[PDB]
A paper describes a structure:
Here, a simple protein crystallization method inside the features of the [name] serial crystallography chips is reported that circumvents batch crystallization and allows the direct transfer of canonical vapor-diffusion conditions to in-chip crystallization. Based on conventional hanging-drop vapor-diffusion experiments, the crystallization solution is distributed into the wells of the [name] chip and equilibrated against a reservoir with mother liquor. Using this simple method, high-quality microcrystals were generated with sufficient density for the structure determination of four different proteins. Additionally, structure determination from intracellular crystals grown in insect cells cultured directly in the features of the [name] chips is demonstrated.
In-chip crystallization was then tested on two additional systems with well known crystallization protocols: proteinase K and [name]. Similar to the strategy for lysozyme, conditions for abundant nucleation and ∼20 µm crystal size were optimized in hanging-drop crystallization setups. The total amount of protein sample consumed for each chip for proteinase K and [name] was 300 and 400 µg, respectively. Data were collected from six proteinase K chips and one [name] chip. Using data sets from proteinase K chip 3 and [name] chip 1, structures were solved at resolutions of 1.65 and 1.90 Å, respectively.
Numbering used by the authors:
A (entry chain A), B (entry chain A), C (entry chain A), D (entry chain A): 2 to 388
The structure:
């Protein structure tokens, strides 16, 4: 079992399976992939669609004629396979002109070029049917304190995103924006480093309803944070527009391992949350097949992404449907957590002697929470060791 | 030189110099301090004021009569010294009843008790002249994934803070609330773990103008984040109500070292930012004199907090006033960062061929940013090695 | 299934299930446990034995008469249950006299007291049948650079361990020493912070054959290290005398979660290594039942430690016995890794043109390693999703 | 002042100032540097010498004739400038053939090629006058647990280093080997991840006296470790053959910032230790000028490396020469730390009632260590704020 179907909404970036294995210390170990072949190979694996940076699809500096031919070859592959394009984004980090950022580069003319390069690809994204446009400000940041006034940089970041919102509104486009946070790498520190910082920034834009987040498993874990906890706050705010699934082994460089690798229990609690909250967006894999692999290992790693999600989905469903677990959840008072603290109102709480004057603090302190039994039941379900 | 004066607005928590040295592996190494003696000793050192948890001032379970005597003894010490009380907060973490949290405990009756305990101390804070009321949700969190539905917990957290805002409004109190984030410890993960998460949460309250943040140097660094960067976003949003100054040596347990210790360059860039942005609030030290020290080392460590701030203030002022630095800032185009990207508007940017069609991407890519020369000038100023 | 038996050699410290829930921010949530009841309760759970600090068994400052009665009550419980005592250790960290360390305290008279306190408990350990004596230097370290000359401290550390080795040799005791490394907490930095540093230090003692390591899962992970990798180097050196099993969620305070929690895949690879290398020592759990739990949750958490080990043992055995895995291991050339690089000798390697002059570097570069397929087979086995 | 002279023994790798700015997300921002020009430019800056990988000097795949011309052009630049070559090393990480390692690659023929490539460059190093040969096993490691049997890998690592030692002995070469540890990146985990693991491994080689360590500031800090503490253990063992100086801002990707940047207080305590222990080897800078910089910023960053060392040297000397500091060191009993615990021997310690039976544990517990006053004196000296 555990066979993906386009109904599962699994998507892959062209840059993921297409990664050649260039890391900061070694040359590429794999030849470049034609975007057309990647689309065909992913379709055979059961994927729902692909995503792209502008420069993944149209090589940098291409003429409007060559650009025309690239889009046509790509769209023919989409038609031949039934693959969708739910998301697109801009490469504002590879070319040396972006070495100090795009939207927040110190040089004003670089910032204007970064906006024009973005707007050009929004047009293409809408043509191809994308519903979400992702922004990863990988070069927005600094290695030293004096190089960037962060208040001025946030002014420039806000100005860029308002202008992009004004453009999609004036064009009548049906597309939303999602910010993909990352705490560091390639810059020493990157602006808007976590999901929380991105959510706070969004509330200061002119049209906040146009903007959400695209959190990535590995990036929040590069700051040692609880990724399921962060996704829950994003859902609670109504801002989970998209999500990047992969693996990461703690606080170190951005590994981009296949989903399921890294923190396995965190992946279980993530799928539990996404499935019970009814997240209906794409399940997007932003990962890198290790450079030890040939092309056969590339497709095996991409297949593993989808397989691990489906296994975890099965185990999280069985966990929540188990009547013994439902009983344990009541023993830990998860049901009381969901009830209002004071629906009777402030004045009733103040006049309630059972809440303070006559509250038996020692009797309440004595109640065990029963969390460890519940967590071992979750472990048994994850490992398939219930019976 | 480097002598503090109450005009410098340096404050200390009673729990800081009063810490007895109890850590998870060892007994206390110092006897308890009378709050009256701490106020007198801090006044002699040049401090501006003190802060307190309710249970620092009035021992838990005290009668209304003993409580009366404690407040009176305290206020007499404030009058004898001229010390102020700019901030107060609630202890919702020491007593075993709070072992699963206060505002977000699974048990509903514990949540109601936590609200009543808080409201009682808001009354006392206003009486004593506090302008800011701090909330540190140290027990709001979890060690395992099934123990806490984070969406429900955020519902309960929002409900608590709205009720507190409704109370201070109905009483006509002139006091604001500040959330002090912490990523972990004592809980495995703590809700609202960074300044960003706290800022985002605040925008969902009913009266957001009543709530800001109280970031602590060490806590953002426990997630490997750039503390000056986070303070800048808090200032940019208008939410820096208060700040906790200390030291921390990277990602590990919460050290609470004296300010200046830990990341020294981060402390320099922090003081630069606070002084140039015109932060006018208290400079509050939330620190622990190491348990290796006797009472003489306690007062030496508290004196060092204030000394290091004043030295860093002098060096950051000299850095910004140096005409060679002002020249280097222009060489790195910090002046262009502060200018609007597109004050001419979206339509003018789209019709501007110098921004894309005729932009010389290679000429712009060739410009060095000159950041390293600027950063060595900052190092020379920090070390007093200019000449 | 998954029922422990004393044949599985599972052991627990008295301080583990006996932990009262005192953390740096809150009072104890559980009453103290009689060591006799802990022995009886662990025997019922299927445990093989217990371990103890001197001060866990005999309260500090006890007379030789009360000490006599404590040992007698304890030994009667061991006889009534069949429980063993394979390991003992000294508490050189709780009492305030040890606030700057024991073996490496700056004060010479404290160092001499620390040696005498240790020697007294070695006598008791041998009487009770312990084969390993563990040393955790939790207070050996510093919060600041000038407080400790590390070369002098290592001189004092070496002097202490040589003296202990001279004592057990002169007494004819059959006991070995094991060092338990920890990188930090409670001290800002702790000496001998990892398994590697401890192994290197041991080679400088007078009788190195008497000393090995007692690594703990959580402690190596507090430095972001690969715990299975560290255990493999300890086995390779012949120094794995003992091991502490628990869980930890990355780089933060020492969590001491039940084994299986934390990094689940790391726990799988650990059990694989221990079982295939034929580690025959105790499987010791150095963990803390969370302070949210009552006594029922304490025993459930201890039962979970043993259960998770037995599940992981089953899955690692099935992984290694799978002929498809054995085939994949050959596809990744694990068999070639085990063969000598140059058994033909140096001169034969130099005269071998197939090793350099005629080596086809591009043909070898093209071979995929097939690691991702192998790792997904390990994931399928871990999750019980093979079929 | 603060002007370097070749007497200060400052060295730079050709790959440092020669770094083109290729990181995992962006193209190079600087053109390649001729090794001859780098030697001339570093000589003008006051450097003592340079170091090189084989492939830095002789491009990969070069004929024996072109190789001859490269060495000749290089040696002429050394003669024209007076620059020395104290250290050389092998590139066993860039070419795709090394994607699973060199000495510990699973494929046996790759391991033999890696040994031959190394031996060829040892010949060149000795010709050029190098005294130390550095080994950085950047590709020795794994991303997943099943890919590498670490015991077998350590067997292959030991076999490689013994063979290299047999070669330099048979040739009568006067050169030593130094291992440069790194915990991760580019591999998920790297073998021998810290200075401690490298020191322990060395004691298992056939000729341990031939091997030491080359620790790097940033690498130990990528595991959150205290770099001065690790250097002290390396000195204590007699194994500090060489050292790499740079900066790093905590646990994240390998930043390789200029020395002085990153953890400034750690850099102060490092220079204090190196200068007081009489380290006489090269002061080598393994750093990367940020890719934001042009060639002018490259030379400014390299000049800053040497400047910051000389400033820190001055401040550490003034700290140790201050009679008030010498007094504070006695107040903290640093003098007692250096005295033997029990030069009177074991039997005298056992018969000494002042060490246990009559030891006043409470009087000793009451003595403050006075560490905070001492550490603020060190801060005052570092900042030049004594007077
Ligand atoms: Co990533
Ligand atoms: Co703190
Ligand atoms: Co532990
Ligand atoms: Co490095």
């Amino acid at each position: 079992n555990y066979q993906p179907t386009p109904e599962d909404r699994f998507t892959f970036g062209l840059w993921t399976v297409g990664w050649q294995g260039r890391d900061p210390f070694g040359d590429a170990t794999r030849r470049a992939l034609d975007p057309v072949e990647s689309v065909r190979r992913l379709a055979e694996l059961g994927a729902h669609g692909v995503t792209f940076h502008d420069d993944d699809l149209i090589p940098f500096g291409s003429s409007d004629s060559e650009r025309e031919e690239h889009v046509k070859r790509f769209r023919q592959a989409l038609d031949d396979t039934g693959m969708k394009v739910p998301m697109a984004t801009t490469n504002l980090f590879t070319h040396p002109v972006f070495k100090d950022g795009g939207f927040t580069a110190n040089d004003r003319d670089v910032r204007r070029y970064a906006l024009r390069k973005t707007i050009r690809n929004i047009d293409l994204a809408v043509e191809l049917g994308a519903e979400t446009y992702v922004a990863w400000g990988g070069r927005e940041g600094a290695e030293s304190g004096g190089a960037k006034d962060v208040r001025d940089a946030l002014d420039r970041m806000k100005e860029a995103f308002d202008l992009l919102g004004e453009y999609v509104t004036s064009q009548g486009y049906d597309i939303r924006f999602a910010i993909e946070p990352k705490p560091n790498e390639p810059r020493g520190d990157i602006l808007l480093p976590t999901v929380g910082h991105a959510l706070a920034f969004i509330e200061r834009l002119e049209r906040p309803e146009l903007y959400g987040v695209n959190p990535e498993v590995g990036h929040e874990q590069m700051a040692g944070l609880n990724f399921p906890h962060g996704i829950a706050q994003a859902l609670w705010a109504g801002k989970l527009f998209h999500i990047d699934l992969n693996g990461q082994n703690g606080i170190k460089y951005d590994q981009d391992l296949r989903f399921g690798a890294g923190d396995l229990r965190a992946a279980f609690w993530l799928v539990d949350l996404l499935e019970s909250a009814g997240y209906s967006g794409p399940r997007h894999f932003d990962f890198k097949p290790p450079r030890t692999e040939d092309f056969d290992g590339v497709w095996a790693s991409a297949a593993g992404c989808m397989r691990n999600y489906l296994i975890l989905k099965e185990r999280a469903a069985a966990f929540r449907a188990d009547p013994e677990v439902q009983e344990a959840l009541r023993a830990s008072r998860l049901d009381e957590l969901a009830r209002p603290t004071a629906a009777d109102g402030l004045q009733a709480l103040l006049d309630d002697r059972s809440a303070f004057e006559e509250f038996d603090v020692d009797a309440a302190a004595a109640r065990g929470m029963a969390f460890e039994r519940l967590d071992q039941l979750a472990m048994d379900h994850l490992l398939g060791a219930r019976g």
